[PDB]
Design an enzyme around this catalytic site. Structure first.
Site, PDB file in Angstrom:
ATOM      1  N   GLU A  11      49.403  35.489  47.365  1.00  0.00           N
ATOM      2  CA  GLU A  11      49.853  34.931  46.035  1.00  0.00           C
ATOM      3  C   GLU A  11      49.259  33.615  46.082  1.00  0.00           C
ATOM      4  O   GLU A  11      49.040  33.101  44.909  1.00  0.00           O
ATOM      5  CB  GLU A  11      51.249  34.717  45.468  1.00  0.00           C
ATOM      6  CG  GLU A  11      51.846  36.271  45.708  1.00  0.00           C
ATOM      7  CD  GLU A  11      51.541  36.923  44.536  1.00  0.00           C
ATOM      8  OE1 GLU A  11      51.908  38.293  44.162  1.00  0.00           O
ATOM      9  OE2 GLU A  11      50.878  36.240  43.660  1.00  0.00           O
ATOM     10  N   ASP A  20      47.439  34.199  35.915  1.00  0.00           N
ATOM     11  CA  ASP A  20      47.266  35.015  36.894  1.00  0.00           C
ATOM     12  C   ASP A  20      46.208  35.984  36.758  1.00  0.00           C
ATOM     13  O   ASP A  20      45.222  35.786  35.996  1.00  0.00           O
ATOM     14  CB  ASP A  20      48.628  35.817  37.036  1.00  0.00           C
ATOM     15  CG  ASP A  20      49.074  37.163  36.449  1.00  0.00           C
ATOM     16  OD1 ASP A  20      50.039  37.751  36.520  1.00  0.00           O
ATOM     17  OD2 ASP A  20      48.210  37.132  35.316  1.00  0.00           O
TER      18      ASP A  20
END
Length: 164
Positions: A11, A20
């Site tokens: 991540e 994202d």
């Protein structure tokens, strides 16, 4: 290697609101804030999440706190879901980490939709399941991360991450 280190690799860590891969407002270590298009709605969710006026920015400490909560919630969510729990209980320690990673990325519901793959993992048919998991939007959208997870289920080792 452990679940935390694994997810930290996948991540990243960002201390300012960001979008994202799907274009959603996120912060920290993959902590989704809102699917809403408003940066304003995002800043509000953030302040609610941290308990202060952040103005779109957080400290390392705050990122890690959210991270701890999210991993905890991922695990608890697996244990509460019938289908998930049965698979989880059947797996070895490393493979357990791979399922947690999927749940953290895509939510309980999403992973629970991988019916066929789940059945294969339960049956310990490693190669077959790896091939089935790759036939998904998930794999097509974030192939490098999906391959890392897939290899982990396939081999039951941390080789995919010992590179990284």
């Amino acid at each position: 290697m452990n679940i935390f280190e694994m997810l930290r690799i996948d991540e990243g860590l960002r201390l300012k609101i960001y979008k994202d891969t799907e274009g959603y407002y996120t912060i920290g270590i993959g902590h989704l804030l809102t699917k809403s298009p408003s940066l304003n709605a995002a800043k509000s969710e953030l302040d609610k999440a941290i308990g202060r006026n952040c103005n779109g920015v957080i400290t390392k400490d705050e990122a890690e706190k959210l991270f701890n909560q999210d991993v905890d919630a991922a695990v608890r969510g697996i244990l509460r879901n019938a289908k998930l729990k049965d698979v989880y209980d059947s797996l070895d320690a490393v493979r357990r980490c791979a399922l947690i990673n999927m749940v953290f990325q895509m939510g309980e519901t999403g992973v629970a939709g991988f019916t066929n793959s789940l059945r294969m993992l339960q049956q310990k048919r490693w190669d077959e399941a790896a091939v089935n998991l790759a036939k998904s939007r998930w794999y097509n959208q974030t192939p490098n991360r999906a391959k890392r997870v897939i290899t982990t289920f396939r081999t039951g080792t941390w080789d995919a991450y010992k590179n990284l």
